[PDB]
Structures are given as C-alpha cells and as structure tokens.
UniProtKB/Swiss-Prot annotation, chains A, B:
Name of the molecule in the record: Ferulic acid decarboxylase 1
Cell compartments where the protein resides: Cytoplasm
Organism per entry: Aspergillus niger (strain ATCC MYA-4892 / CBS 513.88 / FGSC A1513)
One Pfam family named in its UniProt record: UbiD_N
Name of the gene encoding the protein in the UniProt record: fdc1
GO BP annotations, alphabetical order: aromatic amino acid family catabolic process; cinnamic acid catabolic process; ferulate metabolic process; styrene metabolic process
Length: 501, 501
C-alpha cells in the first residue's frame, strides 16, 4: 500500500529516505523516548523509531517520534510532510498547502467499507487491557499524565449521522479504561460533543485511531469546514476512496490499516483531571490541571508489531508548528479568497511560534479596490478572526507582492520596517482568543477573548499607484549583468560558495 | 601600532585572521565594489580589500568593504568588531558592549598632540583635487550621489571649544569641492551645527577623517552623552591617549594615522541636494532627494596607498546593524540602570532590522518594586524614548531572566508568546521618531513623531511571586541525568552531531 495511505508503508518510506533511525535497544517511555524525540525536533534530525520500548506488552507498542517534523536540508526541509501526501520530498510549502486545499473544490470521494484489515490482527477486551500497564509515554517531566494521544485521530459522528469528523486533540490516561483530554470550542470534537449533550440520550460513540493513513492525519490537523466529513475530503485530495473497517463495539468506521484503535464513548456527563501538558507555544505550567472531557475505552484492536506515533511538542520545530500553523494558514488563504480579498498566499511563520499568519496581497487587485489601510485591515480581520480557521492565530501581517511569506526572515523584515506600531494596526478584543497561548490563558486579560491584531505591512503607495522603493539588497540594487559578473567571478576572486547538502 | 589604534594595522589583522580577500584586479567603483561588498554582507563572507580601483588617481584610493560586518562561524561571529577593540575574536556581544560602556565610569584620557603622522604623507590643495575625479563609489544603483562617506568620522567642535564630537553621518559628493549629507536632530553633528548657527558669525570648522583608529570609529557610531568628547572616551576605553595631529587649514585635530583627511567647513547657511540612499532598514526610494547640510572641502591629506573604508549598507547584515543597533542598545542598557530600572542586558535584534531593543529584566529586583505591567512599561518607555539613545529604536521588548537577548530566536519566542497585543503594550505618539524607517518617513503618519511602543513580554507572576512555567524544550523538560544520557548516546544510537567550524 502507498505511504500516504498506510502508516506502516510511511515508516518504510522514511527508512528508505534515510530519514529514520531505528533504535532497537531498550528505551524508557518515561521521558527517554520523548527526550530523544525533542532533541530530534530541535535539531531537525531523522525521525526516531523506538522498536524496543520498556514495558511493551502483548505487541503494544513501538513508538515513532517526530512524524511530521523538519529535515535538516533546505532542499527536502518539508519531505516528511510531502511523504504524508504522495508529493516529492523536495515539495515546497506552497505545493503542500495547495495539495491540502485541492479537495475544497472537488466532490468528496466517500470511503469504502471493507470487511477486515490489519487493525484487526489483535484485540483486547475490557477484561484484558489496562491502559496504565501499557508503555504510554511521559512526554515532559511536569506533564499531568501519560499522553497516549498526540498523533492519533479522534472519530466522532453527529447524532443524525450526516457528519463524521476526524481530528487531533490531545488525551492522557486517566485510569485502566479511561482517558481525559481537551474538547474546547470551536473545535469540531467540541461542536459534535455539544450536539450529543443537547440530545441528552447517550454518551458519544467514539474511536481513536493511531497510525492512520498519513493523508488522513494531515486532514485531521486541518480546519476544513464545519459539517465536512474528513474521510471524503482525503478521498478527493488523494484521488482514492479510503478503506475503512467497522469498529467491533460500535458502528463507527476506522482506517483498515490503523496501527492501534481504541473504541468506546466520550461522556456527555463526566469530566476528569487533564493536563498540564507541554504545549505548542513552548511552555508547561506545572500543577495547572483542569477538568477535561472523559473517554471510556471498551476495546483495543491493533496490528501485529503496532507502532504508536508520538509528537514530543514544545519549542521549535514539531508537528504542532508544521501542521497546526501551516494548515490553518492554508484554510485562511482560501477563506480570504472566498470573501473576495486579494490574498495570494498565507503562512504561519515559525519565528512567531505559529501565532502569526502572513498574508501576501495581490497589490494590483488592491489598487483597484481604491481603499485604505484602516478599512482593509478591518475587513481582513473581521473575515479571519470571526471564523474557526482563525482561532489559533493572534496576529495577521499583511504584506505586498515582493515578500515570500514562506520565508520568515522576509516576513520579519517587512513587519519590522513597513508596519508603524499602533497607527498601522487594528486590535480586535471581541473575538475568540486561543487560551493555550501563555499571554492568553496565563496572561493579564480574558483567557478566551481578544488579544488579536491586524498589522498592515503594506506601504502607502501599494494602495494607490504602486511600490515606490527598491530594496537595498544584492538582488535589487545592482543591474543584472553586474550581479551575474559578481557571481561568475566569486570563487575566482577568493570568496566562499551546494543546494542538496 | 596595534590594530585597535591604527586602521592600517587593522587591515593587516583581518588578513592574518584569514578574514580578508585582497582583490588586485581592476574593480569599478561604479557599483561593482559595493555589489561585491553587499554580497559579502548578505553571506557573512570575508571582508573585501579592493587594491585596484578603476580611476584611482595620485594614490587615492583603495577600498575596504564590510569593515564591521559578521563572520560566518558562530565562534568568531563578532570577530571583526572585536578587532576594533583589542578583544579576542571569540568575544561575545556582551563583552563587546561592556567594552564600549567601560569608559562611562572612568575619567577621560585626553588625546596627545603630535607634530605629524602618516595622514600627512600626501596633500592636495584646493587647486589640485576634484572630488568628482576621485574613485568615489556608487553604492546602490538608485543612489542620488556617490557616497564618499559611509565609514569616516566627522569632527566638529562647539564654538566655546569645550566639546569635540566624532560621529558617523553619511555624505555624498556635490561637486569638485563640496559634499552634502545628513545633519538631523538629535544627532551631535546637528546639535553642534545649531550652536554655530545661533552664534551666526562663521561656518563650522570641520574635518572628515577616513580610516581612523578602529576604536575611534566604534565610539563615533555610539550615542555617548551630550557634551562628551569622543576622543577622551576612546582614550579611557583603550587605556591609551590617542595621538592626534592638527589640520593644516584649521585648528581641529585628526588621528595621526588617518588614511584620508578632508579639511573644510560645514555651512551655517547653504544646503544642497542629498540622497536618496540605500539605507540601514533595507530600502531606497528612487528620486527621493531632499536638501541636506553642505560641506566645503579646502584640503585633502592622506597616507601613501590610502585605503577608504566603505559600508555597502542595506539588508542584513552590515555596519548599520552591528554598530548602530548594538551600540544604541548598549547606551540604552546603561541609561536604564542609571534611572534605577532593573535592566541587565540590552540588544537590538537583527531580525527586527535593529528597530527593536530587547531589555532583559532582573525579575528579583522587579518583584521588590511591587509594580504592574502598565506602570513599568510607561516608566521604561519614558526613560528611553525621551532620550537621544532611544532615537533609532521604535519597539522595546521587556523580557525576564530566562531570555538571552543576544539570541534573536529567543527574543522572538518571548515576544510572540508572552506579550498580548494591545493590552500588554503602551504606544508612545509624542516622542521623536526615526524618519529613516520606511513606515515613518514614507508612512501614513508624521515622519518625525511617534510610532513607538513598549511591548511587555514579562509574564504576570514575574511581577509578583516568580516564574510559574518550565519551557517545553530539551533543556527544561527533562532531568539532568537523562539529558546527559541522551547526549552521550546520541551518535551511538545513529543521530548527527563542531563549535569552531
Ligand atoms: C498536529 C496537532 C494538532 C493538534 C494537537 C496536537 C497536534 C500534534 C497535539 C496533540 C500534539 C497537541 C494538542 N493538539 C490539539 C489540537 N487541537 C485541539 O483542539 N486540542 C489539542 O489538544 N490540535 C489542532 C487540531 O488538530 C486542529 O485545530 C484541527 O483543525 C482540529 O480538527 P477540526 O477542524 O476537525 O476540529
Ligand atoms: C555605523 C554607521 C552609523 C551611522 C551611519 C552609517 C554607519 C555605517 C552610514 C554612513 C552607512 C549610514 C548613515 N549613517 C548615519 C548615522 N547617523 C546619522 O545621523 N546619519 C547618518 O547618515 N549613523 C549613526 C550614528 O553614527 C550614531 O547615531 C551616532 O551615535 C552618532 O554620533 P553622536 O552620538 O556623536 O551624534
Ligand atoms: K480536521
Ligand atoms: K503600513
Ligand atoms: K558618537
Ligand atoms: K505580558
Ligand atoms: Mn473537521
Ligand atoms: Mn557624540
């Protein structure tokens, strides 16, 4: 099966790419696996596959860390993401995000039900598993639990059956047969959980599938629209109907090649202690436990030699940056275009801890709008910050056509030099805020509201008659023939120089 | 003579460091020398010494580009700056700025007058030079003149003789015997020029010395206090009285080993066209010429085989970033401490195009002040933005003790995650602004006023009871013994690793 459609195949692809380190000696799931993974992420090293995890019982489980993190080279920086999607490993961020948006103007391709698959190779009923006995990792030293769930997808369906959502939300072990996790607005797990709570008749049928098709985990991490079943979007994006099998204890459907599947219920009535957790913005607040949503596990099914993917998230760079940020930026780009805003490209700079999105503006189109900074800033922020796609993003930076928004240096340059603090910005205090950002949930103001800004790094003539500067750089401040002469004579003269490396 | 006290010796030091490329074939001062230099600066390459400059007449002149730019290695990144100051090439930014501040609590060491020096080896009177015939560089393709003056020091004295100022301000050739340049408030060349204008009796005696003692050009680039003679501050910093010779046509004194000296007057009545110029923030605005101060040149004296230093300034990284930013940050650090503010360190992040300064706070001292963010932000901004040392700086970022302000990544992390936009900031509209920043002089508001902000990236408990998080990083989220085990086993397990490279 192809790498994008089968996690086991994806692991093989990373090996074959020389982008894997198999660690066959014993590694402790208490901090050691996550520490190695953390180091990998901070240094853009090869992904670690822990084949010998202390306490692995009954085939449960190996760990793959850093599944969606960066490679060291610039040439294949995003290769691990490209391998989720059947793209060449040299794919640009623009190409990856276009691939992720491609299904937005295609008919869904609904999934195909098959009678069995590898995820049924082994099973454990309620009397045969204990989640506290599994080699669940402690990811950060002050975490409030063992976070089994950092890179699986929760599967829940609307009561009426019309919408089946796949998403990543964290979860930790509560006891032998329960998890706790985050289910917060405006996320689709929360929106569906609300529907069940209002019907008030039963707990929500649930499954959590780990080691799912890489193309499915990418969609799981993307804020595609309300009511849209991720399976059918992935089907359209890949051009292939995904093969699903039914759960044994409920009527939900899981990817046939899932490494590990939990089946059970998400309670409409019960909560339990959840967190703290080392989070995407790079912090943990010791002792900061709150009540989260509570899941009961009734059944585990799993592949022979099952592999649990894990995100050791925190400071740059991991899945929380490469996937949360970039895929929100992708959705935002589309949302802006669908609202008739002249946005060509969007990216969440890593340097902003993916709390910013830079929006590249088609300034020819802007000029034709005959508008002003104050008006345009307000329009853009109203579109984005009133929508779920804008949830995680606290600052939008508008930049003209000369800026490559996928290059953080250039975004920082434009922001720092073209946006006058205060005057060129509009603050938004009556929008939903992202509480996980420290300055929100642990800050001076409301955890859940405001703290958002549109920063306009368009220069004044970009609204009127056109750019009226040239950069003071090698590219723009010297004619072509001279630049080429300099480059041609560079090593001859005695200076230093390869793209791949 | 030592490298820090003699420019010729400094050039030798760079050679011997393997930090120089001597280019002995013909190079055009029309753009080619500056293009090579620009490429050097954008790639942190070796400094170029142009020994064969097309149009060099009567020993005038060779060019050294990138005299204060960065080296490629992290280990000696700042080595070219260290070589200005007699510091080891491995010196940290903290060590360089402490060296630059060391004279602030020392008695000046006044200069020593000597009867002659190398700068008297050759002379040209009014009938014998023509500044339009010299190989003055065109630094950027759209510059409004040939900028002879990018790395020399202007020398002017108060009418009463009590203060002799050395500073860098740009100047370009106007005609055979005049320059035009920038003389803008609150800079000391402007402040002294004002004194002469109010006395109204004569033009200002002036000299411009190129290829001065490297320690003197560093002080020339630093906003040491009003009324303080830079020569005596350099003397104290270096522990050595600087040797000066008298000009031939006026009673000012120039460094004995100056490569090239112009003697003349700065007019109290006349102006001429000046600019545009490719500037420190990375822009030029074609055709944007304004009236600037006008200098008359009466005499040139120069060393045999004179070398003109040149800054090909613009986008990162050159003298305008490494020297303007860092030395303003140094002065700001001291200014804050002298105002009883608990600031340990200051640096202007390159990523901000040196428009920000990050201020590291001693949070133990902050806690004892029993204050709030709104109060502390206002206090800091009033101190800094009402002072000349704060002129070029539009955003101050306050950070706690865990942040290394000399590391831009860490500043960006703190800013992005700990400062809530709007609520955690104070805007300052009634302070002097820096017009050269595009969003000021070419922006939506007053070119010369406002557009400044204090952004508080201290978290709330840093004011009260102490930091209440741990980072979600390898350093802080794993115990010491585990971290060391991981590092010790790193290459054994199969991952990738040298400090010098
Ligand atoms: C890649 C990724 C995405 C996480 C995530 C992580 C990763 C690795 C973790 C597990 C390591 C850390 C926490 N995560 C959470 C999360 N969203 C959320 O609501 N709660 C979370 O706990 N997200 C983001 C979430 O997946 C996106 O916002 C989706 O758009 C949600 O899908 P939906 O649009 O269908 O609701
Ligand atoms: C290192 C450096 C500093 C320049 C400078 C440049 C460099 C290379 C140039 C020449 C390449 C580009 C323009 N420069 C100007 C400048 N200050 C100013 O008022 N006008 C200028 O044109 N500065 C900054 C100035 O030197 C500092 O603000 C000093 O503090 C001024 O000294 P003062 O405190 O004695 O006035
Ligand atoms: K999703
Ligand atoms: K602007
Ligand atoms: K000075
Ligand atoms: K703050
Ligand atoms: Mn969804
Ligand atoms: Mn001065």
């Amino acid at each position: 099966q192809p790498a994008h459609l089968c996690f086991r195949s994806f692991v093989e692809a990373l090996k074959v790419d020389n982008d894997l380190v198999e660690i066959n000696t014993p590694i402790d799931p208490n901090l050691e696996a996550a520490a190695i993974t953390r180091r990998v992420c901070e240094t853009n090293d090869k992904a670690p596959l822990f084949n010998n995890l202390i306490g692995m019982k009954n085939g449960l489980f190996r760990i793959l860390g850093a599944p969606g993190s960066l490679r060291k080279s610039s040439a294949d920086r995003y290769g691990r993401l490209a391998r989720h999607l059947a793209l060449p490993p040299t794919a640009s961020m623009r190409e990856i995000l276009d691939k992720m948006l491609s299904a937005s103007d295609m008919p869904p391709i609904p999934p195909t039900i098959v009678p069995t698959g590898p995820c049924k190779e082994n099973s454990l009923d309620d009397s045969e598993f204990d989640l506290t006995e599994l080699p669940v990792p402690l990811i950060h030293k002050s975490d409030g639990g063992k976070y089994i769930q950092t890179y699986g997808m929760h599967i829940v369906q609307s009561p009426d059956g019309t919408w089946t959502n796949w998403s990543i939300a964290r979860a930790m072990v509560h006891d032998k047969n329960h998890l706790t996790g985050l289910c917060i607005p405006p996320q689709h797990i929360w929106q569906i959980h609300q529907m069940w709570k209002k019907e008030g008749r039963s707990d929500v049928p649930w499954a959590l599938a780990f080691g799912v098709p890489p193309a499915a985990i990418m969609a799981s991490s993307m804020p595609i629209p309300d009511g849209v079943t991720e399976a059918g979007y992935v089907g359209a994006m890949t051009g292939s109907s995904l093969e699903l099998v039914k759960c044994d204890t409920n009527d939900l459907y899981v990817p046939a090649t899932s490494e590990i599947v939990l089946e059970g219920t998400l309670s409409i009535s019960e909560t339990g202690p959840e967190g703290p957790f080392g989070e995407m913005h790079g912090y943990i607040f010791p002792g900061d436990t709150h009540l989260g949503c509570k899941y009961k596990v009734n059944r585990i099914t799993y592949r022979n030699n099952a592999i649990m993917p894990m995100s050791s998230c925190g400071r740059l760079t991991d899945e929380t940056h490469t996937m949360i940020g970039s895929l929100a930026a992708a959705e935002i780009r589309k949302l802006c275009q669908q609202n008739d805003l002249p946005i060509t490209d969007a990216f969440a700079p890593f340097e902003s801890q993916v709390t910013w999105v830079a929006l590249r503006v088609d300034t020819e189109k802007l000029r034709a709008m005959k508008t002003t900074s104050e008006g345009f800033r307000k329009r853009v922020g109203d579109v984005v910050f009133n929508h779920k796609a804008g949830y995680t993003i606290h600052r939008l930076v508008l930049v003209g056509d000369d800026i490559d928004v996928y290059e953080g240096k250039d975004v920082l340059w434009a922001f720092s030099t073209r946006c006058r603090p205060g005057m060129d910005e509009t603050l938004f205090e009556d929008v939903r805020g992202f509480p996980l950002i420290p300055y929100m949930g642990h800050g001076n103001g409301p955890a859940h509201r405001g703290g958002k800004v549109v920063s306009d790094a368009l220069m004044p003539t970009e609204y009127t008659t056109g750019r009226n500067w040239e950069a003071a750089d090698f590219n723009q401040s010297y004619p072509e023939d001279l630049k080429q002469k300099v480059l041609d004579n560079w090593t001859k003269m005695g200076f230093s120089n390869h793209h791949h490396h």
